[PDB]
Amino acid sequence: PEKVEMYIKNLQDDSSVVRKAAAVALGEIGDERAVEPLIKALKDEDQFVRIAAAWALGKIGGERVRAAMEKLA
Template sequence: MSNNIEEPIKMLRKKDWKIRMEAVETLGDIGGENVIRILINILNDDHWKVRRAAINSLVKIGEPAMQPLIEELRTGTQTKKREGAARALGLMRDERAIEPLIEALKDEEENIRDKAAEALGEIGDRRAVKYLEETLMDEHWFVRKSAAEALMKIENKNIRDYMW
């Protein structure tokens, strides 16, 4: 590892979330494929601001992060990391994420379904409409709400159009 990566990696071990967040932002500025896995692991951090910084850093890295994020969403075992992957994929607005996010609408974890619906709304591709409409019947209200909000973004309709 190069010296410019070693220092932020050391900072990631600190208890202070502000220091960890700064380290994550530094890694995002450095960029490159060698920091992607580190940032994906940080999606499991205890503090939401550190996780948000990791998401933003992955989005900033862009294309090289796409496939590792899709892989994390599909096969990861930690909910926070999978949620973060879905969020980052939505913010990247790349159509290659549509199919994995549609698959995630059927995930057993309600938080994953929720973040997948939000991400599909961010991408805004009409191919997701049918699947988001099916998600309006989810057992969890917050998943239904995210699906309705995503449909509103994609279809440019009022939420009342999706109320049952």
């Protein structure tokens, strides 16, 4: 939906729950553009933003591995 740049922006919102929600949204998109911003979010002051960023990176990485293995098979 090209709203990935909006959630990448939200990773800087003053509301910890908005930054957490942005990391989860980005994990559910599965886009590689979110990778560098999410790795940065692993240093966020809030525990839950860090958890959401580790979760999102896992989801993106799994999708990347799956699509590459799919091409092969």
